[PDB]
Amino acid sequence: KLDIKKTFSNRSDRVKGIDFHPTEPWVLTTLYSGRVEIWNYETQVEVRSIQVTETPVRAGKFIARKNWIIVGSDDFRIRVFNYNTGEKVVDFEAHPDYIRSIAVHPTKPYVLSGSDDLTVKLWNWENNWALEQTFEGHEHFVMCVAFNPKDPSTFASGCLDRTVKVWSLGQSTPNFTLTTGQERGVNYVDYYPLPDKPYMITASDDLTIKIWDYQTKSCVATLEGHMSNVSFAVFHPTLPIIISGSEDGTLKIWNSSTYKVEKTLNVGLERSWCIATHPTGRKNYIASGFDNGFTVLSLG
């Protein structure tokens, strides 16, 4: 039963990245101001925060099994910090242009970064953060990268060139390129995590969200209702819903069978930029970052 409760919300500078820790009740936010924050959303006290840089930090993920966070910023750098001590673990120039998105492999010591330099890069932390591969082919900014959780030897990249490319690690060309028909670009791509559907979802400045069958490459559905750029759309990992967020200031919760909107939320933090869902669905938590702060919600 959908019963949305605000578990914790705080104001800050614009939140561009956000992520949940899988075992501590913590959320990481990465800010346009160069600051990152880790909050305990149950006690409502900061665990740790760092002034990383003076440029925006658009991307940040926990790497829980190593006690790290990894972040990427407009100064072209990837940094990794130990969240227990604050210590900086590594600091390197990853691309010659902004970093939009970082994904962490669930099982292997790999990280993907996607950038305005038109590539995705694969880094290996068990090989001194060596660059192991550069995936070339996109023709505008790479806005989003995400591993297929059912087969993390493959990953999807979403691009302002209006395509999604799906790639295999260790192979230089995409397995396939999806021509989205989202003419203003793709801001975000996400996989449905369960084995019953081979689905991906994309979000666009053209105000649409689209569901794809990645076996047949067909568009299964198009979800309309947002009134400004759609920054993200994801499938909830346990509940039968899709969650999206937009520069129109709303989050929307859509029924994932009927693709109809169930609930529209204006949390009143202005434009929405990023999303995370709790990996194990603890309290069905989701969190979103906005112009004016973040919010952590229990969906029921």
């Binding site: 614009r14 346009y32 939009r100 900014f141 806005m143 302002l160 434009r271």
Partner: peptide, 5 residues
Amino acid sequence: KEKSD
């Protein structure tokens, strides 16, 4: 820059 914000 596109997508500056």
